[PDB]
Amino acid sequence: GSHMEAVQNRIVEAAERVPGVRGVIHLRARYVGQDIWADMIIGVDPENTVEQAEEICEAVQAAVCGKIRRIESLHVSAEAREIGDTTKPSF
C-alpha cells in the first residue's frame, strides 16, 4: 500500500542522488517473504555510452541497497532521458 509507496519513494529519493541519474522512469516492487525485490529503470544522458549508463546503474544499485536494508534484490537498467523531456514517465 502506502508503505510500498513509502519504500518506493525512498528508492526514488536515494537513486536520484546518484550522479548520472536523470530521474526514475519505472519502478516495480514487491515482497518475497520479509524481503523486497525491486526492478527499476532510470534515465541517463542519451549521449552517454551504454557502458557508462550500466555503471551508473551499478552505483544506483549500491547506493539504494546500502540505504534500504530490506531490499534483498534490486535490478537497475537504463533508458534515454533528455533534459527537458516529457516523452517518458517520471516520479
Added chain:
Amino acid sequence: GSHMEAVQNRIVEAAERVPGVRGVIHLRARYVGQDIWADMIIGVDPENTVEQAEEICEAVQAAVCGKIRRIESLHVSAEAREIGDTTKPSF
C-alpha cells in the same frame, strides 16, 4: 504455458533479427484480455551511445509488433552485452 513459451520464442526469434540486437536478456509476457502485453530487455554493444540503443529498441518494437499481431503492447529497453559475455542471462 508452452503457448506463452511459443509466443516468447517468436518474440525472441523476431527481435534477434533486428540489427544492433545482441540477444534477449529478459522477457516477461502476459495476456490482458485477448491481447498480449510484453516487456523486454535486449543486449547491445556497450560502446553504442544510449540514444543508439534506444532506437535499436524502437526498431525491435516495430519488427516484433508487425510480426506478431496479438501483441497490443511491447516495451523494449536495453542493457550492455559484450560479444563473449556470460555475466548476463540469455534465451
